[PDB]
Design a binder for this molecule. Structure first.
Ligand SMILES: Nc1nc2c(ncn2[C@@H]2O[C@H](COP(=O)(O)OP(=O)(O)OP(=O)(O)O)[C@@H](O)[C@H]2O)c(=O)[nH]1
Ligand SMILES: Nc1nc2c(ncn2[C@@H]2O[C@H](COP(=O)(O)OP(=O)(O)O)[C@@H](O)[C@H]2O)c(=O)[nH]1
Ligand code: BEF
Ligand SMILES: [Ca+2]
Ligand SMILES: [Mg+2]
Ligand SMILES: [Mg+2]
Lengths: 420, 440, 57
């Protein structure tokens, strides 16, 4: 298993997708012309996971760019590495959902889904061994939220035995003031819970709290938030892109990280935001989490730790055992050896050492609890529905999405209270 | 004749096969291109090393081996490594998508697509044998291929070759180098379905080898290369009786008669000495008595367990190098009067001794020192059931909550297979208690 | 010697049949697993066609 097909949908999906392709491109020594100019053969070892080999030794991202608004078409191509994307993998509309989940999932989104699916198949047809899909998108918008989930369920029909990965950005009143975001988020997780295998919860409330309180940014940009997303997106995919033993492909990660098919929502962490002891405890700290969840308010089902840079593996092994035994109360005992660690020699650009954390923690319920609380504060009033009922939807979909997300929470709590 | 065919399954099995065949080539004077200038009979012959190496007209000595993995990564290194000329390409079988640490994928979904090709290539090795003795299967307990595909393979070999002997070298999982949380599952599953089809299984606890490398060889953080070069020495001691001769050489099958009192009780404990660095071996070579004493130090065992708290049903000593029976008997007498070796009351207490005079060799750039004499002890002790108990407990912790079980049901398996495999292990743990109680 | 032959042959026979059943039973379970998730995905398409047509009315 080698090739991953990447999809970016919506404003956020295309933005965080661009800076993801920018970072790993620098790590793999690839300029915007698709030419290789690195000095370690370990950069070309698994280049096929994310890059096709074109004519003349040029590397083209296996990326598909989607948006119902033709705004982002310019921005991507105008931004760095805009040419690197193949022109035909650009599929766009003219009128977007306007932050309406229904428009992106059932009407204007369903009118465009056949177009992107055609690009998915050609990109998948020439895969030696298609490994799976990863989607970048927001859950509080229209296209990435509504049409992203529809695209997942459509790809899953044609590839039911492949891994479906998503980098789902969650809404937060601290970043966006759009009122219909708790609606779009709940309807999305209702779909993600059923049709995806792995979901990295990139919580915007977390990203801002770090930029404001940690990095000391009064009015941080979307770029300041996205520099965090790019840092972690590179971290969680390190084991996929470089020769390694642990979680080297999406399925092995899934088997290691997901004990119950619905509890597949991960709490990513990153450090720094330097010695191995400090990297470890910071990596396990609440402030370094990219989801607004205190891991010590719940329990860990599984954890994947990734250290990058030149360092003593003996020290890493000792510190990972040290943090586990000193915090044993936060690791369910009915899953032995549920913390796995990987070390990559090459570090991310700008740092000597770094640590990326992927945690399946029952504390993620705090994130879903906050959304459902903001959801029920508008559903109890029956507010702003005509933007959704006017597109053909009924109350059944809203109440069913509400019930399913609250079920996810109680299931995370059911295994938090489980004993031996 | 009495040829022996080796089958290496999955990453661990393949990478251990690399270390073993390299060591074999060094021990027999075989060059990376297969040439052996000492072999004066070209194209054939019935020498002792021909149990493991066939011969071509061009003078190439070819391992009687098959390398199979459901992913090309690990075997590709064989195709381009130092010994790429040693194997004909038909011996290195690869798929394109591995089992992803899932027993179900290795035994069913993916494994069933390549099993017929593997058996066909094994058949072509068997066809060159004038008196095939049996198979040596190297695999991990925890990997999806090493567990699922091995058991599928072992089942098919029982059909295609009857009760032709099948021996295992099994890698028992350890958290220091483990790669999957579900390794307890794959271990119980593969042990249950293989138990009927295996005549003798040498378990190698990765944590035991890991500790030996850290403790005895100044390796702060042992890698698979450190572990596999130590494992190959043990495998070499065991197969040395088949690949060499000598007036005092005792055939492995003769040890096997003493080691397997009942079909299911076929898991010998291996302990190897001396594991010593060149810096410490310099100007100090260990006598026969010293390496024999080390065989009863639990820290030198291949599986973590306490034989002092169990009973012995057999004790075999496989000596290698400069060793004469006089020193052996003296060392055994010292031990029998200074160690805690209790036997079950239904089997004799004599130690079975074998000596191959061909001295052990080291792989260049290795860690262990070149010693004049080495010894591997094979003992059938009830204490090895401790290794089952540790695995069965981890299995129970996860299975009580059905954790990760959906990954197996999704591939076609049923919960019944989990409980059926677990109770086979429960009965196996119980079988080891029964053989230890005294007669009445 | 005829009993030894009968024993080995019966060991081969029953091993061949238990494996045949397992490989057939495993295929039926995996297919039913996939058949279930696809029939549940098409019902999302029936609900989608029913939604986009309910807009007109
Ligand atoms: N001693 C030793 N153990 C190994 C080696 N390689 C892997 N292992 C162990 O094997 C177990 C995992 O099985 P693998 O062999 O890596 O995987 P596999 O058999 O190829 O199965 P899949 O990858 O899922 O298809 C873990 O417990 C590892 O620690 C090795 O080279 N030497
Ligand atoms: N972190 C981050 N969040 C974003 C970005 N752009 C939009 N968002 C979030 O996404 C939500 C709006 O969704 P949007 O991207 O407009 O959906 P679209 O209609 O499919 O493009 C809001 O909650 C924003 O906070 C970005 O560049 N970075
Ligand atoms: F801005 Be999105 F298309 F709703
Ligand atoms: Ca010859
Ligand atoms: Mg937009
Ligand atoms: Mg493998």
């Amino acid at each position: 298993m080698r090739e991953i097909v990447h999809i970016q949908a919506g404003q956020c999906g295309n933005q965080i997708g661009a800076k993801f392709w920018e970072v790993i491109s620098d790590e793999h020594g690839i300029d915007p012309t698709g030419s290789y100019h690195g000095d370690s053969d370990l950069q070309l070892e698994r280049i096929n996971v994310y890059y096709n080999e074109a004519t003349g030794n040029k590397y083209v991202p296996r990326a598909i760019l989607v948006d119902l608004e033709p705004g982002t078409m310019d921005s991507v191509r105008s931004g760095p590495f805009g040419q690197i994307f193949r022109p035909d993998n650009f599929v766009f509309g003219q009128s977007g959902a306007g932050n309406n989940w229904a428009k992106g999932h059932y009407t204007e989104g369903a009118e465009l889904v056949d177009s992107v699916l055609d690009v998915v198949r050609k990109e998948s047809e020439s895969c030696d061994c298609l490994q799976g899909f990863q989607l970048t998108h927001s859950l509080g918008g229209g296209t990435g939220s509504g049409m992203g989930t529809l695209l997942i369920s459509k790809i899953r029909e044609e590839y039911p035995d492949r891994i479906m990965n998503t980098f789902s950005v969650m809404p937060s009143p601290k970043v966006s003031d759009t009122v219909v975001e708790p609606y779009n988020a709940t309807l999305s997780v209702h779909q993600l819970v059923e049709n995806t295998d792995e979901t990295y919860c990139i919580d915007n409330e977390a990203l801002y709290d770090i930029c404001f309180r940690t990095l000391k940014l009064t009015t941080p940009t979307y770029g300041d938030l996205n520099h965090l997303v790019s840092a972690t997106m590179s971290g969680v995919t390190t084991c996929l892109r470089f020769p390694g033993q642990l979680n080297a492909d999406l399925r092995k990660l899934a088997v290691n990280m997901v004990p119950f098919p619905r509890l597949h929502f991960f709490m990513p962490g990153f450090a720094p935001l330097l010695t191995v002891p400090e990297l470890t405890q910071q990596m396990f700290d609440s402030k370094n989490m990219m989801a607004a969840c205190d891991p010590r308010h719940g329990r860990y089902l599984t954890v994947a730790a990734i250290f990058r840079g030149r360092m003593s593996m003996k020290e890493v092994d000792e510190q990972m055992l040290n943090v586990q035994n000193k915090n044993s109360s936060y690791f369910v005992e009915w899953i032995p050896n549920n913390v796995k660690t990987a070390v990559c020699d090459i570090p991310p650009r700008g740092l000597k050492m770094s640590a990326t954390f992927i945690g399946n923690s029952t504390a993620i319920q705090e994130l879903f609890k906050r959304i459902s609380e903001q959801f029920t504060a508008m559903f109890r009033r029956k507010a702003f529905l005509h933007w959704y009922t006017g597109e053909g939807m009924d109350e059944m979909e809203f109440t069913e999405a509400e019930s399913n997300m609250n079920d996810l929470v109680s299931e995370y709590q059911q295994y938090q209270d489980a004993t031996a | 004749m009495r040829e022996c065919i080796s089958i290496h399954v999955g990453q661990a099995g393949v990478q251990i096969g690399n270390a073993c065949w390299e060591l074999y080539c060094l021990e027999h004077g075989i060059q990376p291109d297969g040439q052996m200038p000492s072999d004066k009979t070209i194209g054939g012959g019935d020498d002792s090393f021909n149990t493991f190496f066939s011969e071509t007209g061009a003078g190439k000595h070819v391992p009687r081996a098959v390398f199979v993995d459901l992913e090309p990564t690990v075997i590709d290194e064989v195709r381009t490594g130092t010994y790429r000329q040693l194997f004909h390409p038909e011996q290195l079988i690869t798929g394109k998508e591995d089992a992803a640490n899932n027993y179900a994928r290795g035994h069913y979904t993916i494994g069933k697509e390549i099993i017929d090709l593997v058996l066909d290539r094994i058949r072509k090795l068997a066809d060159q044998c004038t008196g095939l003795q049996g198979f040596l299967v190297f695999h991990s307990f925890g990997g999806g291929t090493g567990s699922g595909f091995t058991s599928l393979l072992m089942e098919r070999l029982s059909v295609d070759y009857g009760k032709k002997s099948k021996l295992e070298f099994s890698i028992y999982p350890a958290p220091q180098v483990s790669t999957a949380v579900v390794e307890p599952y794959n271990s119980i599953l593969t042990t249950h379905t293989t138990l009927e089809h295996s005549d003798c299984a040498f378990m190698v606890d990765n944590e035991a080898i890991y500790d030996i490398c850290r403790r005895n060889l100044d390796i702060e953080r042992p890698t698979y290369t450190n572990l596999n070069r130590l494992i190959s020495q043990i495998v070499s001691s065991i197969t040395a009786s088949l690949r060499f001769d000598g007036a005092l050489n005792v055939d492995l099958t003769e040890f096997q008669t003493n080691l397997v009192p009942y079909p299911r009780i076929h898991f010998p404990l291996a302990t190897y000495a001396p594991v010593i660095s060149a810096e410490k071996a310099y100007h100090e070579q260990l006598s026969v008595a010293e390496i024999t004493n080390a065989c009863f130090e639990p820290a030198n065992q291949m599986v973590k367990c306490d034989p002092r708290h169990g009973k012995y049903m057999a004790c075999c000593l496989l000596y290698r190098g400069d060793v004469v029976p006089k020193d052996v008997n003296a060392a055994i007498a010292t031990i029998k009067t200074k160690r805690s070796i209790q036997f079950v009351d239904w089997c004799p207490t004599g130690f079975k001794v074998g000596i191959n005079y061909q001295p052990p060799t080291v792989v260049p750039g290795g860690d262990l020192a070149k010693v004049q004499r080495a010894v591997c002890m094979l003992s059938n002790t009830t204490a090895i059931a401790e290794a089952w108990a540790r695995l069965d407990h981890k299995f129970d912790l996860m299975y009580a909550k059905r954790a990760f079980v959906h990954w197996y049901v999704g591939e076609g398996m049923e919960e019944g297979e989990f409980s059926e495999a677990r109770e086979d292990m429960a009965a196996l743990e119980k079988d080891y208690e029964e053989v230890g109680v005294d007669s009445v | 010697i005829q009993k030894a032959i009968e024993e080995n042959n019966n060991f081969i026979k029953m091993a061949k049949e238990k494996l045949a059943q397992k490989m057939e039973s495993n295929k039926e379970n995996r297919e039913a697993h996939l058949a279930a998730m696809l029939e549940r995905l098409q019902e999302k398409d029936k609900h989608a066609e029913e939604v986009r047509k309910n807009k007109e009315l």
